[PDB]
């Protein structure tokens, strides 16, 4: 950071960042992101085999 | 006393300039070496002198 | 080498076959450009979701083979595949690979020499980072920020030019061998192109990404924007990052590229030629175009012709599109009437005369416009929205921000439309000395008012007391304007709305023609008149730098200097190809004839007599050196020249060559009264004064491609003359025909011959003599 | 222009065998590097590069009947080892313009046993304390420095 405006919406952001991370939709989005990435990388590698 | 001390914000970009009456009331914010060269003292000053 | 050999044997089995021999043999080279579309045609809808797909596979990256062995790139480093054997179906000529290859390429790969050359290949985005260095930023604040939509430029760009000699100078900095018959912009603008030259020339480089990144450079970008404060490109870059509608980011960037005080000094030289030129009633129209071209000022390092900055150029301002008028230029569609603009959103109307008496009776015929007409305007921080109907203003909405600007434009607005008892009967305190005829022209009553109006405040007052004031009714207390622009007020003047936020500038990319009269009234396909001589500040002083005005008329030096001037613009006037003259002496060697040359004959007097000798043994010892070995330096040759009229005589050489004006010139340094640059050598500045060298022959600094081409000419087809290089162009022999292979698919024939005369000059002198 | 084309051009049909005087002033040269030069040039009793943006001397090849050097305006720096064994029969020796921070660089050229006269000018090392004497006494065959002998004896013209 370099100017007050920078430092102001990296404290917004850490603070909502912290509110958001502890719910459980948070947990599903991360159980999303990381099946679905996994289950792409399968899908695009492995076809043909279950 | 001298002249007051001055605050400011991390950036620098908001600087305050009080009196030296007035640093006993804003201790809690100045840095220890400047507060333990001062509590000691308040018994002393009157206004903004130091009998 | 090899390669020129596989190369030709390319083309002969492309000849071999039939239909490839067809499409070559027919039509011309054009049909290269439709070929290149018919063929790699494929897209994709969804970009993300195919390259995320992609980057699964164990090889997404085609690439090139002999590259990679050549590189002693393995297919495997540790254990991890790279790539394999394999031919890309569409190019046939590349092999598939991983991604994970750049990685090791770029950590253990071949290292080139120096990679600062980018530096110069993007110098935009270099300048951007060099510009944001610069700013102190002061303090986030929040606020209702009030923020107009107009067109502005988003990038700080120096010599903004257009696409069509954009397009010469990626090819005469690139492809020279390749490049299209000289141009009038590559002769007139040669500094430019040594110094984009010099830096990529002789380089690894992929051409095309720098033509590109050049063509980028020199584009402003023009974007349709919300705007707050000041309007610089220096701004508009990281707009971004100064302010929205609730916020505020203060910043200091007054002092980075300044690029507002070369369109100052423009405006400037604009103003003060349109009003040099008004002395001449019946041929100012002439005058003013001989005015402007026989004049230049400074850009940076080079030097540019007024004529051409004029066409570049965006200002929207009266000095400016009279100008532009004049020498044939396009313009915007936007006008103007004193010190503030106009835009027409709609409407028509027709001419109708109508009198007025100044004093008693004196009836003077004023015009005014008949039908509905809705106008944008602006004043200096102030912007409105009215409407006329019939001689008569319907309504006024504004939505400044200043109680002064808005008196102003309400007033010259009124003006505009000939609104008001005033008009109908003239105020007693103007008299008919005003009226008209300053300098013999007559000034139409609009304009009286105007120059009332500026003359006192009380005036003005009583021009806005004539609008019918009234009572404020309720509520409509806040849209109100008093007589000194209040925002609110019990008491208002009639129908004239106010509001908060400024009205946002209306845009159309259309280009309207417009001629201009003998007094210098530019009318533009219908009555209106765009602009006029009576809407530009009465006169002023300045001490303008690093310009040109050769002309003698606007000159204030004295005959000895201009004397000199004029000398060596005559000694430069032989450098032209034929025999007889300094560049077939210097090839054949024949320095003596130098010396009687008329030019010098006429310059001789100045040299200081007492001690012409010693000065004429010098310089004539000096050329000979530089013409016998055949290393020379044309301008020092033009510099003591002069001095090689008279004979020999012996004494001490202090080292400077004196005039009888106490001027010298001391022979090798540069200064005043002769200097020049080894970076631009197509100028010598005399005086300040710049004197263009034709460009005919080359020397050791200058040497190159371009210093020889405004020599050459076009000529009748002759086949007997040989085909030569480019590079062979040098030696060839004054007056000698040779054909040449020019741009692409082309075959000319070129005489060594300078034959390019005025062609405006010719062109008016003939068209006048139509109208005897 | 370019080494290679200015010294083409200067060779109105000649052999690289038969001149007794070079120029390449005002060109040039990739890298910074000579470029052009070999060993078929044996009667060459002069040479000139001035302002080529010269920065080493790597490529310079063995030529014996050279004479006279000069190497203004450029920015070689530290290689003064070969004109021992390229050049040993060289006398007049210019480096005026050129990056010189020591003397140490300066030391090989006390092989040059032919050696009369050198020329250092504007160079970091002449910003020195009691420079011309030590140089003096480092090169003892040596006796014109910049054009003046000790003692201040200005050299004739030629």
């Given at each position: 950071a370099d100017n007050e405006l920078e430092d102001y919406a990296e404290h917004l952001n850490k603070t909502m960042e912290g509110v958001l991370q502890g719910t459980n939709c948070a947990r599903e989005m991360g159980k999303c992101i990381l099946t679905v990435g996994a289950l792409m990388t399968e899908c695009r590698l492995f076809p043909g085999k279950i | 006393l001298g002249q007051g001390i001055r605050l400011s914000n991390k950036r620098k970009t908001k600087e305050v300039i009080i009196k030296a009456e007035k640093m006993g009331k804003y201790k809690?914010?100045?840095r220890e070496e400047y507060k333990n060269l001062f509590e000691p003292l308040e018994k002393y000053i009157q206004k903004d002198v130091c009998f | 080498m090899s390669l020129l050999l596989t190369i030709a044997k390319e083309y002969k089995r492309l000849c071999q076959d039939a239909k490839a021999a067809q499409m070559m043999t027919?039509?011309?080279?054009?049909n290269y450009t439709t070929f290149k579309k018919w063929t790699t045609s494929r897209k994709e809808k969804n970009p993300s979701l195919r390259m995320r797909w992609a980057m699964s596979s164990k090889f997404p990256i085609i690439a090139n083979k002999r590259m990679l062995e050549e590189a002693q790139?393995?297919?495997?480093?540790?254990?991890v595949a790279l790539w394999e054997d394999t031919?890309?179906?569409?190019?046939?000529?590349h092999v598939l690979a991983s991604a994970s290859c750049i990685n090791y390429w770029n950590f253990c790969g071949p290292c080139v020499?120096?990679?600062?050359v980018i530096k110069e290949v993007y110098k935009s985005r270099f300048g951007r980072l060099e510009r944001r260095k610069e700013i102190m930023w002061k303090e986030l604040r929040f606020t209702l920020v009030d923020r107009q939509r107009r067109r502005v430029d988003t990038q700080p760009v120096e010599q903004r030019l257009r696409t069509g000699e954009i397009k010469d100078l990626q090819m005469w900095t690139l492809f020279e061998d390749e490049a299209p018959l000289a141009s009038k912009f590559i002769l007139d603008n040669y500094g430019l192109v040594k110094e984009m030259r010099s830096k990529f020339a002789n380089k690894p480089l992929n051409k095309e990404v720098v033509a590109h990144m050049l063509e980028k450079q020199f584009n402003p970008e023009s974007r349709f924007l919300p705007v707050f404060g000041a309007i610089r490109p220096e701004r508009m870059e990281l707009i971004h990052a100064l302010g929205g509608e609730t916020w505020i980011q203060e910043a200091n960037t007054?002092?980075?590229?300044?690029?507002d005080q070369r369109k100052n000094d423009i405006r400037a030289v604009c103003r003060k030629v349109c009003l040099a030129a008004?002395?001449?009633?019946?041929?100012a129209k002439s005058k003013l175009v001989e005015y402007i071209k026989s004049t230049s000022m400074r850009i940076g390092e080079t030097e540019r012709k007024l004529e051409e900055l004029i066409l570049e150029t965006?200002?929207?301002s009266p000095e400016v599109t009279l100008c532009k008028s004049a020498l044939g230029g396009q313009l915007g569609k936007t006008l103007s009437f004193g010190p503030m603009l106009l835009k027409k959103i709609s409407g028509s109307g027709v001419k109708v005369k109508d009198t007025v008496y100044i004093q008693g009776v004196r009836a003077v015929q004023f015009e005014y416009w008949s039908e509905q007409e809705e106008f944008y305007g602006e004043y200096k921080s102030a912007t409105a929205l009215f409407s006329r109907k019939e001689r008569s203003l319907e309504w006024i909405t504004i939505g400044g921000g200043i109680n002064e600007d808005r008196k102003r434009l309400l007033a010259m607005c009124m003006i505009f439309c000939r609104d008001g008892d005033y008009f109908k009967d003239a105020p007693a305190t103007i008299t008919m000395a005003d009226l008209?005829?300053?300098?013999?022209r007559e000034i139409p009553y609009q304009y009286v008012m105007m120059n009332w109006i500026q003359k006192s405040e009380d005036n003005l007052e009583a021009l806005l007391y004539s609008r019918g004031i009234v009572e404020t009714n309720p509520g409509k207390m806040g849209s109100s304007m008093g007589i000194?622009?209040?925002?609110?007020?019990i008491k208002s003047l009639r129908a004239v709305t106010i509001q908060s936020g400024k009205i946002d500038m209306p845009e159309s990319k259309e280009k309207i023609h417009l001629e201009l009269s003998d007094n210098l009234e530019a009318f533009d396909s219908?009555?209106?008149?765009?602009?006029?001589?009576?809407?530009?500040?009465?006169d002023k002083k300045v001490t303008f730098?690093?310009?040109?005005?050769?002309?003698p008329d606007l000159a204030v030096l004295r005959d000895e200097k201009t004397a000199i001037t004029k000398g060596y613009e005559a000694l430069i006037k032989?450098?032209?190809?034929?025999?007889?003259?300094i560049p077939s002496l210097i090839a054949k060697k024949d320095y003596l004839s130098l010396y009687n040359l008329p030019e010098v004959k006429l310059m001789a007097?100045?040299?200081?007599?007492?001690?012409k000798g010693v000065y004429s043994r010098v310089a004539r010892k000096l050329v000979s050196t530089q013409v016998t070995?055949?290393?020379?330096?044309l301008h020092e040759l033009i510099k003591v020249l002069?001095?090689?009229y008279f004979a020999p005589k012996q004494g001490m050489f202090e080292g400077r060559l004196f005039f009888s004006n106490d001027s010298f010139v001391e022979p090798g340094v540069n200064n005043n009264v002769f200097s020049w640059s080894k970076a631009d050598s197509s100028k010598i500045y005399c005086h300040g004064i710049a004197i263009r060298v034709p460009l005919v022959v080359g020397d050791e600094?200058?040497?190159?491609?371009?210093?020889?081409?405004?020599?050459f000419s076009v000529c009748e087809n002759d086949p007997r003359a040989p085909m030569v290089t480019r590079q062979d162009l040098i030696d060839v022999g004054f007056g000698q025909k040779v054909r040449l292979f020019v741009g692409q698919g082309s075959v000319r024939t070129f005489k060594r011959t300078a034959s390019q005369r005025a062609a405006s000059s010719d062109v008016n002198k003939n068209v006048k003599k139509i109208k005897m | 222009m370019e080494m290679g084309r200015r010294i083409h051009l200067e060779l109105?049909?000649?052999?690289?065998?038969?001149?007794?005087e070079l120029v390449l002033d005002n060109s040039r040269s990739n890298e910074g590097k000579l470029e052009?030069?070999?060993?078929?040039?044996?009667?060459?009793?002069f040479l000139s590069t001035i302002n080529v943006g010269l920065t080493s001397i790597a490529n310079l090849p063995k030529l014996n009947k050279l004479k006279k050097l000069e190497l203004s305006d450029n920015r070689v720096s530290?290689?003064?080892?070969?004109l021992a064994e390229?050049?040993?029969?060289?006398?007049h020796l210019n480096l005026s313009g050129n990056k010189i921070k020591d003397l140490s660089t300066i030391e090989?050229?006390?092989?040059?046993?032919?050696?009369?006269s050198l020329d250092l000018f504007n160079?970091?090392?002449?910003?020195?304390?009691?420079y011309r004497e030590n140089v003096f006494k480092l090169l003892?065959?040596?006796?014109?420095?910049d054009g003046y002998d000790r003692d201040d004896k200005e050299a004739p013209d030629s």
């Open positions: - | 809690n914010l100045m | 027919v039509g011309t080279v054009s790139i393995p297919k495997e480093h540790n254990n031919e890309d179906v569409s190019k046939r000529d020499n120096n990679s600062e007054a002092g980075i590229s300044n690029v008004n002395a001449s009633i019946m041929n965006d200002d929207v008209s005829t300053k300098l013999g000194d622009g209040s925002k609110r007020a219908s009555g209106r008149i765009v602009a006029t001589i009576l809407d530009l500040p009465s730098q690093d310009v040109s005005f050769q002309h032989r450098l032209g190809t034929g025999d007889n003259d007097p100045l040299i200081r007599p007492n001690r070995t055949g290393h020379y330096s002069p001095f090689t600094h200058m040497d190159t491609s371009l210093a020889l081409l405004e020599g | 109105r049909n000649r052999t690289p065998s038969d001149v007794k052009g030069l070999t060993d078929e040039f044996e009667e060459l009793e530290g290689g003064l080892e070969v390229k050049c040993p029969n060289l006398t090989p050229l006390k092989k040059l046993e032919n050696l009369k160079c970091e090392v002449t910003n020195l304390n009691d003892p065959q040596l006796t014109y420095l």
